Structures are given as C-alpha cells and as structure tokens.
C-alpha cells in the first residue's frame, strides 16, 4: 500500500474492462466460464489448447 | 452454414417415393411393404434390377454412389410406410432398404474385391470364417441438465467424445431411454477355398452387420450380402457396411 | 528405371493405401480436395494452417 500527494495531468474516457471473462474452444467447444482477470494494467492469457 | 435445400435429393427421394408407390403398377413392391409392416420389421429387400427397368438412370446413380443414394430411397421407405401407416412408422426411429438381383461388375468375390470399389455398392460372395459376439452400439444419446433444466442430443453415425457436462460444466445424465442404441456384430468372409489358387494368399475382408442383420450369419456360412464398400478413418483400412445378407 | 532379377522372400498382406485424399480445417471447415498421394511408401503432408 501505497499513498501520495499531486495534481492530475491527464484522464482517459472511461471504459468498460472486463473482470469475470469466458471462452470457447473454437473446435472442441470446450468452455472456460467464469475466468478471473486480475484488475490492474494486465493484459490476457488465452489457452494453449 | 446451414444447408436449406437440396434439390438432387429432393428428386431422388421422389423417384424412390414413386417407385415404391406401387398402386398403379402391379403392387409387388406395395405387397412387400404391406407384408413387411405385418411382419414388424424395418428392412424392406429391394431387386435392383426392378430399379433399373424403372429408372436406369437412378439405378446407375445407386451402385455409383451407394452412400447418398441409400439415405434417399430409406426417407421415401420411411415416408411411404407413413403413407400407408403412421403409428407404425412412428413405432421406428427408421427404416432400411435391402439391395437383391444382378449386379454385373459389382457382383465380385474377396479375391477380386479391389480397391477401386470403394463407394460403390458390391455384392461379394464368399464363406464366412470369424464372426464377433452381438454387442449394442450407441449412435445417439440424449443428455439432460438439470441445472439448466435443458435437453441436449448428439449422434454419431460415422462420426472420450461421450459428453457428461455442460459448457458451464453443469452434470449431465444421460436418459438412457430416449437414447439410441443397435446390436452391431462384425464377421470376416474369404473366397471359397474350392475356387481358389494355392500361390496366391487370402483376402479377407471385414463385414460390419446392425439391427435384423446381425446374428443372420454364422462362422462358416456360404452366402453372398450386398453393402456399401467403404475406407475407415486414418495408407487406411477398409471394411463393408452390409445392407442385406442372405445365406445361398 | 530399372530392370533386375532376384526372388522373393517375404510378402505383404493385400493392403489399401490412399492416392486421392481430401482433408478439412476442424475449426475454419477450410476443406483442401482432392489432394493427390505420391506413389511409394510414405506417409501423408499435413498444412500448417
């Protein structure tokens, strides 16, 4: 934890990222639901198969 | 992707559906059905060469291509008997078409069984050896979800694979009796070994039997069973599904 | 081409072996048709995608 002091310089328009995700094997249909992404700058992770 | 019409079917259903009606004709083929219905089977035997006295067009469209062809003439089988009868029809998820009379080139024996056959219909001749026991094969098995509360099917026909969960991973339980299951026995014919030579070797070839065809057969049987020669799945193997067998 | 004597010592099983094959992408239904075998005794060529 972390606290500090300032002024904001800059905002970006507010969007939607996405939390509680789901995928589809394209093929084998296989389905992963209620796959957590971390919050924060992250990027995905898909499966390898 | 999904398929709407197809009208090649859509005519050659027809051309069966006006063979088998047999009204204005002499009603051998109507008889047979009729007598087939009393009987409660659902393998109607057909003389090929009644085909081709009617339409040799359609009856060359058959031995060149068994598999399509086939799938056709048991929808106008199906249809008809519901014609003639409903509930009857209704009593089986389908019906099937046995092939019987004179096939010139594909009349052949396990020696001359080539592989150019394939896809086509071939009445092979021969002396059966090794038979399997009778065991019941799943084609279509239906699931239900009692989370979701909802029904789901598969079936496999040509095509681990057995589902048991939803794609939210729900249990699955199978209702085993809507589900479709058929005896399904495998035999191996050989050329007689009277008419054989001593330099060559054997040809066996494997023969897949379902339903009333199963257990009409027994090792060392001569008989002759019409069916289509097809590959299996993978330099491949290759086995004869039966549409009809008869012991000579 | 050549031309030689000799006899036979061992012989196979009158087996089939695929010329014309045709094969489909499992996902995209990409189907490639009618893809000729070389004669000989090898095996198969799969595509990359």
Not at chain 1, 23 to 40: E, F, H, K, V
Not at chain 2, 175 to 204: C, F, N, W
């Amino acid at each position: 934890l972390v606290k500090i002091p300032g002024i904001i310089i800059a905002a970006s328009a507010v969007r939607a990222k996405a939390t509680r995700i789901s995928i589809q094997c394209r093929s084998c249909r296989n389905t992963l639901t209620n796959i957590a992404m971390r919050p924060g700058l992250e990027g995905y992770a898909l499966p390898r198969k | 992707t999904v398929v709407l019409d197809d009208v090649e079917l859509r005519e050659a259903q027809r051309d069966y559906l006006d063979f088998l009606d047999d009204e204005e004709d002499q009603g051998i083929y109507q008889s047979k059905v009729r007598e087939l219905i009393s009987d409660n089977q659902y393998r109607l035997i057909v003389n090929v060469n009644d085909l081709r006295r009617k339409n040799e067009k359609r009856a060359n469209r058959l031995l060149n291509n068994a598999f399509e062809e086939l799938v056709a003439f048991q929808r106008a089988l199906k249809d008809f008997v519901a014609s003639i009868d409903a509930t009857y029809a209704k009593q089986y998820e389908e019906f099937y078409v046995g092939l019987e009379g004179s096939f010139g080139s594909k009349h052949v024996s396990p020696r001359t069984l080539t592989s150019c056959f394939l896809s086509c219909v071939v009445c092979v001749e021969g002396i059966v050896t090794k038979c399997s026991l009778v065991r019941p094969k799943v084609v279509r098995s239906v699931h239900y979800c009692p989370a979701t509360k909802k029904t789901i099917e598969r079936r496999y026909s040509d095509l681990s694979v057995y589902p048991t969960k939803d794609e939210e991973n729900n249990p699955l339980e199978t209702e085993y009796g809507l589900s479709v299951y058929k005896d399904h026995q495998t035999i191996t014919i050989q050329e007689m070994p009277e008419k054989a030579p001593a330099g060559q070797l054997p040809r066996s070839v494997d023969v897949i039997l379902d339903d009333d065809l199963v257990d009409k057969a027994k090792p060392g049987d001569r008989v002759q069973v019409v069916g289509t020669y097809r590959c299996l799945p993978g330099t491949f193997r290759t086995v004869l599904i039966a549409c009809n067998v008869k012991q000579m």
